[PDB]
C-alpha cells in the first residue's frame, strides 16, 4: 500500500518512534505496512501492532460514547429539536470506528491467524479478533448485531480452548484473554453470572500457580490478576 516502498525494519523502527511521540495513528499505519510485508510477527512486533490499534480505537470509542450520550438526551421528552447534526456526527465517528475495526480484522484474516501455529501467537491474534468484533458489537443496532456478537464469542472461545490446553494459568496472554472475555459476557452478551464465574475461576487458578514464578513473572501476572479483582469488585 502506501508503505509498500519502505523496508520492514524501517517500519518497525518508526512504529517505535511513533509510540514514544504518542502518534498512535502513525504507529498503526506503520504496523499495518509491516504486516502487509507478509512475514510473521515476533512477540515484540505483535505487541506494537496491538498497542497502536488499541489506542486509535480507544479514542474513537470514547468519542462515540460522548456523542451517543448527547444524542440520547436529544430524544428525551421536553428536549428541543436541534436537527440532524448530532446523529450525523455520531454516524461519522461510528463509521470511522467501524473502518478501523474492519482494517484490523482484515489483517488478522489476511493472513496473521492462518500462519500462527504457536499457541502464544495464535491465542494473541484470536483475542484481538474477539476484541475488535466486541468493539463492532458496542455500536451495532441492526439485523447483524447477533452475528457480530457470535463472531466475537467464537473467536474468544477458540482462544480460550487453546490457552487452557497449552499455557499455564498465570500466563499474561491467558489472563488478559480471560479478563476481556469476561467483560464480553457482562457488557455485550447480557451474561453477568458467566462474567463473574469466569473472572473468579481465572483469578483462583492463577493464584495457585504463582509459586512457580520468578520475581518478574510474578509481577506481571499479579498486575493482571488485580484487574480481574477490580472487575469482580465492580460487579459484586
Amino acid at each position: 500500500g502506501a508503505m509498500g516502498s519502505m523496508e520492514r525494519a524501517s517500519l518497525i523502527q518508526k512504529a517505535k518512534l511513533a509510540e514514544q511521540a504518542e502518534r498512535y495513528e502513525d504507529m498503526a499505519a506503520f504496523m499495518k505496512g509491516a504486516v502487509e510485508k507478509g512475514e510473521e510477527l515476533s512477540c515484540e512486533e505483535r505487541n506494537l501492532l496491538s498497542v497502536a490499534y488499541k489506542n486509535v480505537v480507544g479514542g474513537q470509542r470514547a468519542a462515540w460514547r460522548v456523542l451517543s450520550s448527547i444524542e440520547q438526551k436529544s430524544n428525551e421528552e421536553g428536549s428541543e429539536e436541534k436537527g440532524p447534526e448530532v446523529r450525523e456526527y455520531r454516524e461519522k465517528v461510528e463509521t470511522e470506528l467501524q473502518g478501523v475495526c474492519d482494517t484490523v480484522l482484515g489483517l488478522l484474516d489476511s493472513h496473521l491467524i492462518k500462519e500462527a501455529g504457536d499457541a502464544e501467537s495464535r491465542v494473541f491474534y484470536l483475542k484481538m479478533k474477539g476484541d475488535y468484533y466486541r468493539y463492532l458489537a458496542e455500536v451495532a443496532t441492526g439485523d447483524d448485531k447477533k452475528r457480530i456478537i457470535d463472531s466475537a464469542r467464537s473467536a474468544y472461545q477458540e482462544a480460550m480452548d487453546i490457552s487452557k490446553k497449552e499455557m499455564p494459568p498465570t500466563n499474561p496472554i491467558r489472563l488478559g484473554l480471560a479478563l476481556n472475555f469476561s467483560v464480553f459476557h457482562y457488557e455485550i452478551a447480557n451474561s453477568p453470572e458467566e462474567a463473574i464465574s469466569l473472572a473468579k475461576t481465572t483469578f483462583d487458578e492463577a493464584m495457585a500457580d504463582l509459586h512457580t514464578l520468578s520475581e518478574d513473572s510474578y509481577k506481571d501476572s499479579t498486575l493482571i490478576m488485580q484487574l480481574l479483582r477490580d472487575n469482580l469488585t465492580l460487579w459484586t
Binding site: 488478559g176 467483560v183 457482562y186
Partner: peptide, 5 residues
Amino acid sequence: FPATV
C-alpha cells in the same frame, strides 16, 4: 467501565 487489556 470495566478493565480490559
